[PDB]
């Protein structure tokens, strides 16, 4: 409602999750070769490398503006091959996934991006947060495990941060006696048999349990 620019707390104060910030950095992995090596032996004029340059530049200087619209993010430094966006925790993750996919569209799945997102508390000196900072994460973690987990907690109340944090306490200590204890805890919960069964089957497997840890941490 106020058009005037507001402070970094203007994104901290979101109540849909912890009151924290998100920062994202991305680099094109195959960009040194692309401007240098380019297309071998037959398209290596000044004209064709020039048009490739213009295409990448216009992508990072218009397409970001359009892609970021539905997101609570302000654009800091973007261009060349550097992507530096800061905003709300959940929003940064969602926008990062959207941008990765939309880039793979525009580069026809030829060029890849590497990116890092971290959770940084409000009112930190931003000079210090900057020096700190795909298909797998989208399909396996966000789409399947996160969705079933969110539905499970939505259906069954009273599963506050206490129950989830006891789940963490059992999980992070990778021991079989802890697996039995987690079985007892899930038995004492009142989730549907499907939810409990899926959680326990995932808990038996290392890759799945790390992914489960990440997903439920995202739930909070």
């Amino acid at each position: 409602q106020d058009m005037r620019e507001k402070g970094i707390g203007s994104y901290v104060d979101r109540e849909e999750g912890v009151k924290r910030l998100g920062v994202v950095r991305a680099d094109i992995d195959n960009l040194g070769a692309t401007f240098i090596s380019g297309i071998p032996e037959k398209y290596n004029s000044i004209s064709r490398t020039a048009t490739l340059s213009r295409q990448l530049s216009l992508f990072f200087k218009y397409e970001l503006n359009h892609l970021l619209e539905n997101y609570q993010i302000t654009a800091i430094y973007s261009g060349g091959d550097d992507l530096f966006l800061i905003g709300a925790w959940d929003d940064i993750i969602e926008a990062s996934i959207y941008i990765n996919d939309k880039f793979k569209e525009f580069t026809l799945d030829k060029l890849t991006l590497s990116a890092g997102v971290g959770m940084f508390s409000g009112k930190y000196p931003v000079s210090k947060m900057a020096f700190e900072t795909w298909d797998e994460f989208k399909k396996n973690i966000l789409e399947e495990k996160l969705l079933v987990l969110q539905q499970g907690f939505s259906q069954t109340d009273e599963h506050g941060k206490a129950f989830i944090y006891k789940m963490l306490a059992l999980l992070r200590n990778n021991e079989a006696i802890n697996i039995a204890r987690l079985a007892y805890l899930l038995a004492r919960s009142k989730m549907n048999e499907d939810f409990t069964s899926k959680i326990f089957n995932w808990a038996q497997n290392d890759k799945d349990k790390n992914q489960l840890i990440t997903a439920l941490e995202y739930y909070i």
């Binding site: 040194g32 930190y124 000196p125 210090k128 700190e132």
Partner: protein
């Protein structure tokens, strides 16, 4: 200072002109003693650069939060003033090491002073609980061999600045980085905030030179009761 790990010792990257990526070498800072002559003679490959970088886990960084309740929180309703400190922690077999040279008497005195210093600190917030150390003197054959070569170039291992009358011939053919080195002083005048050393620039700890220069301990002093010294004397590695 130069870091170490369990049994590996490290020196900085010579800013030498290698003619081939220009990417993998840029992300690299330090090259252990085993492969140093290999680096100087092009015997290091890109996959080797990736591997050496991969093995370079020798400590991690952290910010510890703190609050300061000396303020009117003593007196009346008044907010606390949180501040932050930056810290580094080494894994149980890491640390830093020195290289010193001089007469035997000078080194005996240095030993005495170092014994005095191990129970003081070597950092910032010493008095608040950061930065004590225990030291050991070990003679590593390989580092000695590296230090006692003879060549045509020179790798500056410390931070130096040539005196006024030698810089013109010192900078004939060189590759170097300058660093504004600043800071305050301890017990010079009444106000610490009012006293602050004049800024000083010196070559970094990886520069390469053709003609050696000796340095000098330069004053950064003014408006003070005693001289305040800054150090600029090179320790050369000749290959």
């Amino acid at each position: 200072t130069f870091p170490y790990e369990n049994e590996l010792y490290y020196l900085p990257k010579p800013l030498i002109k290698i003619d081939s990526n220009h990417k993998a070498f840029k992300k690299l800072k330090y090259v252990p003693v085993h492969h140093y002559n290999q680096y100087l003679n092009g015997e290091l490959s890109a996959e080797d650069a990736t591997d050496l970088n991969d093995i370079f886990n020798i400590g991690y960084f952290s910010l510890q939060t703190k609050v300061s309740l000396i303020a009117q929180e003593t007196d009346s309703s008044a907010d606390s003033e949180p501040y932050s400190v930056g810290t580094f922690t080494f894994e149980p077999e890491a640390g830093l090491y020195f290289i010193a040279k001089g007469s035997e008497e000078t080194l005996d005195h240095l030993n005495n002073i170092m014994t005095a210093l191990q129970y003081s600190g070597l950092g910032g917030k010493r008095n608040a609980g950061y930065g004590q150390f225990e030291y050991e003197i070990i003679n590593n054959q390989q580092l000695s061999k590296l230090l006692n070569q003879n060549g045509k170039h020179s790798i500056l291992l410390s931070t130096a600045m040539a005196k006024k009358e030698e810089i013109e011939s010192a900078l004939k053919e060189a590759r170097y980085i300058l660093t504004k080195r600043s800071g305050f002083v301890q017990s010079t005048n009444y106000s610490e905030m009012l006293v602050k050393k004049s800024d000083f620039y010196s070559f970094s700890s990886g520069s390469v030179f053709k003609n050696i220069f000796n340095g000098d301990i330069f004053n950064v002093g003014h408006n003070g009761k005693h001289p305040v010294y800054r150090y600029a004397k090179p320790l050369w590695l000749e290959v």
